[PDB]
């Protein structure tokens, strides 16, 4: 899913592939300021990428609306504790799905015993794991 | 930098829902059926494919300048001194 | 030692070659011999030295220093590849014990036993994990212990387990 | 494939750099070892002696008088020594690594695309009656029937035929592959790609329709995830002995395919030649 | 000798995977590193 | 030449060990001063060697 702001104008720039195809994109709305110190506020911006070329796909089959509301906290989240009492609940992500202010979640999620024992997910869509990142290599010695 | 090692527990991704919707079912069957025309594989090499860069695990290391300075150094002092055992040269010879 | 760190037609054809280079240097002698440019051709690659087969003016120059940089190249490029081929030779099993996994599901081409009835035939029925090996085991044992040396130095068998203080006099004293 | 990858490997040490202050300093040099003598040695007849001298020394050349010269050109030996023997212990070093190669990418190929119109007639063993011969049927029918003509035997029988003499190809489920090919003797099968696969949709447990068992079963299977018994498993019942990294190949011939940039230099090299024969016999004629 | 000294020089500081010792054993100049209590921090909570 | 220089650079790849003496018997630990530096072993008291 990328991020791109808006131009100027409000409608979204036009941009090709290596096929010379216009990428799909649409009118996504995320917090300005990234920053968690500063005050977000709503501002228009352009979200394009694979997960939306999978819902648009989804669309021409389904024949329903959208409107795309990006995240409020910048998070995943997982089960942690209300901070007021011994009740754990969901910050992050998956909570704004289970409050009233979500019905689908096209994201980079994956699947878990606790998130699926919550909610009813779908067959998956790509079968990653998880690895490990370190940096290249330089020329070497054998010096004078 | 480059990614290394193995694949240790491995989940796979997924569209989330709300539990007792009406769409779940259509949702998981049309993402099925689009599993199956190429589609994913279609977008994963149209956007998560056009990886430029490669990895060639191989070559070892080839001498650059670092391992040659010295050959050309003792060239260059070569030279330098043959200047001046040119005229200690002549100055013995027009002595004897 | 001879065409086996080349291939085995590259050497009539850098025959050819030398023979075409020789032939061609003879034979530009006309700006402004023939067995003089044969002998140089033939001794520079070969390094090692007759007659004193100067070329001619200019051409014959340039013919022969390319001619000699091929020579320096190939002579060179021989002695990396044997030294590479001899450095990755002295193949083997060099077995790590029960780690390896070739021995934890052998084929019939490998073979290794021990003494019947003894505490590592105990010992093996006390694993849930290594059945098969049991069976290939006990497909062929010897009921003695002093025996199995012999065999295994007639190379009917090659992997004899066994306790550790009789393996370690035995293989002290017998050298193979 | 036990293939090398060396197509112009010939040239890989010293970095295509250090030639021309080579070449420089050796003119330098000859220009300085014939100012000194000059206080039958020309200015074009000492880059012929130090050219010789630096390429394993074997034409006859005219040595100098001067003493200095001496020096000079016994100082330019012990830099052609060093010079040889670092090229060629570099170049013994580099024809060490050689691991493999990949023959073929996905089904995206013009070579998967090539049933006839190709090299001697092709052919992919495949199981009869079988998912992936209805999924294929589904996707690009040329390789149905037109490319699928050879229909393989079964999945033993298919890969005993590859390993024979037939050696076509073969396209079948991914575990059962990795598998097989994991554990097998020698090291003469391996799936290219091993991680690009076309049609993921994993195995699975099935169940009668709306049941209600499946909550149940489906928590409890996600949970073996969650403290990873299932690489346990798979690691004592799925690996085989195969797949531990490589080591070489050391193509002993090296045909002349691998060394061919040599013979291009050298008709670079008689191309000029003649050019500068042409040129000569024009100019020396006005 | 040169030779010897230009084949055998590789270093190998590379982490084969959840079994490299360099990973197990903790260390001060090979950290590694994760993200804010997501999917992946779950699972390492799981198993003590 | 060519294989003799190259044959022995592969004996130059491998190197065997450094290893000792073996046991608690002998002249290079039987008498401390009988040697050439003065040997000051290891031995920490109150413990196995010590009794």
């Given at each position: 899913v990328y991020v791109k702001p808006t131009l100027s104008d409000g409608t979204c720039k036009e941009e090709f592939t290596v096929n010379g195809d216009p990428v799909k994109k649409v009118i996504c709305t995320g917090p300005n300021d990234?920053?968690?110190?500063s005050p977000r506020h709503t501002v228009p911006q352009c979200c394009y990428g694979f997960c939306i070329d999978l819902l648009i796909k989804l669309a021409r089959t389904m024949n329903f609306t959208y409107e795309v509301h990006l995240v409020a906290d910048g998070k995943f989240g997982t089960?942690?504790?209300?901070?007021?009492?011994?009740k754990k609940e969901w910050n992050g992500m998956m909570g704004e799905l289970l409050?009233?202010?979500?019905?689908?979640?096209?994201?980079p999620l994956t699947i878990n015993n606790e998130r699926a024992q919550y909610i009813e997910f779908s067959k998956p869509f790509k079968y990653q794991g998880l690895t490990i990142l370190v940096k290249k290599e330089i020329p070497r010695s054998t010096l004078d | 930098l480059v990614t290394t090692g193995e694949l240790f527990f491995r989940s796979g991704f997924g569209i989330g829902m709300r539990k007792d919707s009406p769409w779940k079912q259509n949702v998981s069957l049309s993402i099925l059926k689009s599993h199956e025309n190429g589609f994913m594989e279609d977008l994963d090499k149209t956007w998560?494919?056009?990886?430029?860069?490669?990895?060639?695990?191989?070559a070892p290391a080839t001498l650059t300048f670092e391992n040659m300075a010295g050959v050309f150094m003792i060239v260059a002092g070569g030279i330098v001194a043959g200047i001046f055992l040119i005229f200690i040269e002549i100055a013995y010879k027009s002595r004897a | 030692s001879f065409m086996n760190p080349f291939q085995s037609t590259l050497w009539l054809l850098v025959g050819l070659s030398v023979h075409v280079v020789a032939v061609m240097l003879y034979l530009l002698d006309r700006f402004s011999t023939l067995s003089s440019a044969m002998w140089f051709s033939w001794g520079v690659l070969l390094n090692s030295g007759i007659g004193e087969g100067a070329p001619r003016s200019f051409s014959a120059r340039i013919l022969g220093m390319v001619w000699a940089g091929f020579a320096m190249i190939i002579v060179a490029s021989y002695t990396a590849n044997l030294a590479a081929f001899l450095v990755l030779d002295r193949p083997?099993?060099?077995?790590?014990?029960?780690?390896?996994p070739r021995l934890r599901n052998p084929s019939d081409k490998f073979i290794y036993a021990t003494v019947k009835q003894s505490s590592v035939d105990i010992y093996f029925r006390r694993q849930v994990e290594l059945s098969t090996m049991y069976r290939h085991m006990e497909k062929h044992n010897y009921?003695?212990?002093?025996e199995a040396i012999q065999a295994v130095r007639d190379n009917k068998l090659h992997a004899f387990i066994w306790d550790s203080a009789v393996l370690e006099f035995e293989a002290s004293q017998k050298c193979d | 494939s036990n293939g090398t990858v060396s197509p112009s490997a010939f040239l890989e040490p010293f970095s295509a750099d250090v030639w021309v202050m080579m070449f420089v300093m050796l003119l330098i040099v000859s220009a300085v070892a014939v100012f000194v003598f000059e206080y039958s040695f020309t200015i074009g007849k000492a880059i012929w002696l130090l050219w010789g001298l630096v390429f394993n020394n074997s034409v006859p050349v005219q040595n100098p008088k001067g003493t200095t010269s001496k020096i000079m050109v016994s100082v330019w030996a012990f830099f052609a020594v060093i010079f040889l023997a670092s090229y060629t212990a570099n170049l013994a070093a580099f024809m060490i690594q050689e691991e493999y190669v990949d023959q073929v990418s996905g089904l995206s190929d013009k070579k998967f695309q090539r049933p006839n119109d190709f090299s001697p007639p092709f052919r992919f063993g495949t199981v009869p009656n079988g998912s992936t011969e209805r999924n294929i049927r589904n996707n690009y029918a040329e390789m149905h029937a037109?490319?699928?003509?050879?229909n393989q035997r079964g999945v033993d029988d298919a890969l005993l035929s590859l390993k024979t003499g037939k050696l076509d190809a073969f396209i079948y489920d991914a575990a059962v592959l990795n598998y097989m090919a994991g554990r097998?003797?020698?090291?003469?099968l391996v799936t290219i790609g091993?991680?690009?696969?076309?049609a993921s949709t994993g195995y699975g447990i099935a169940i009668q329709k709306?049941?209600?068992?499946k909550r149940q079963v489906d928590l409890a299977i996600l949970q073996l995830f969650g403290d990873g018994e299932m690489e346990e498993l798979e690691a004592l019942w799925?690996?085989?002995?195969?797949?531990?990294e490589k080591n070489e190949?050391?193509?002993?011939?090296?045909?002349?395919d691998n060394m061919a940039g040599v013979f291009y230099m050298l008709g670079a090299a008689m191309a000029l030649s003649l050019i500068t024969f042409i040129s000569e016999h024009l100019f020396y004629w006005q």
């Open positions: 990234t920053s968690p110190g089960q942690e504790r209300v901070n007021n009492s011994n409050s009233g202010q979500a019905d689908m979640i096209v994201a | 998560v494919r056009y990886q430029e860069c490669d990895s060639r695990s191989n | 083997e099993e060099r077995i790590t014990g029960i780690n390896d009921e003695s212990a002093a | 037109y490319m699928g003509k050879f097998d003797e020698g090291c003469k091993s991680g690009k696969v076309f709306d049941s209600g068992w799925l690996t085989g002995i195969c797949h531990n190949v050391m193509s002993s011939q090296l045909d002349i």
